């Protein structure tokens, strides 16, 4: 699926 | 309580622009991306894009890149929408949501704002 | 694009009744679909995410199945808070799109 990079 | 509350509505003339607030409490706000989805009045559900929280990173749809910047403000957890160059086919009830986002990739939008109406007319 | 075909666009159905409603993709999106209910008003809630896994909360009466293009919502005895539209979404590439609904109406 689509991602947006890593997060907290 | 997982909440997110949006701004008030807004009445714009045709190439105006108007900016969305969506505030997040319960949870740590960067830790979810943020969806914008919008709606018109008697139709379905149209994605805009998502912003990362944590980096500030964007993916606009494309009908909308040029003249629709998402942003964030970390430390009042509030993600913004901006929509420039309005016209009449902008009206619509404007949302934002959170994705679940496990393993970092798109899951399903499991808390949503309450929806901010814009109406765009002369 | 990928464009989500939703069959029917209306129903109208008695409480009670097994609701069966379909989602078809333009494209193979795998199990990367989720379905959501809403009532006029209100925002969409989201039910179902890999396709076939119910969201916490949801009344196990809804259930899902499919992965590639054909897609399957059952809500397997209609009670009077399920009267609404239903969505498919998927998130296989951008952009993110949603089928059309289904507005499920009462019988009378």
């Known amino acids: 699926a689509v991602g947006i990079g890593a997060v907290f | 309580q997982e909440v997110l509350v949006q701004s008030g509505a807004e009445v714009k003339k045709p190439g105006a622009s108007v900016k969305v607030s969506c505030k997040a409490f319960?949870?740590?706000?960067?830790?979810?991306?943020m969806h914008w989805v919008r709606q018109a009045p008697g139709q379905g559900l149209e994605w805009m894009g998502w912003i990362n929280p944590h980096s500030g990173d964007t993916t606009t749809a494309q009908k909308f890149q040029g003249r629709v910047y998402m942003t964030r403000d970390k430390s009042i957890n509030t993600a913004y929408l901006d929509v420039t160059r309005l016209t009449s086919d902008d009206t619509a009830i404007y949302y934002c949501a959170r994705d679940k986002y496990y393993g970092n990739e798109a899951v399903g939008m499991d808390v949503w704002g309450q929806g901010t109406t814009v109406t765009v007319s002369s | 694009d990928i464009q989500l075909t939703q069959s029917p666009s209306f129903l109208s159905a008695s409480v009670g009744d097994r609701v069966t409603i379909t989602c078809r993709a333009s494209q193979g999106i795998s199990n990367e679909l989720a379905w959501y209910q809403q009532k006029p008003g209100k925002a969409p809630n989201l039910l179902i995410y890999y396709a076939s896994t119910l969201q916490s909360g949801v009344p196990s009466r809804f259930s899902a199945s499919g992965s590639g293009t054909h897609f399957t919502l059952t809500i397997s005895s209609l009670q009077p808070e399920d009267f609404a539209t239903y969505f498919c979404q998927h998130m296989s590439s951008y952009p993110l799109t949603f089928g059309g609904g289904t507005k499920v109406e009462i019988k009378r």
């Open positions: 319960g949870y740590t706000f960067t830790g979810n991306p």
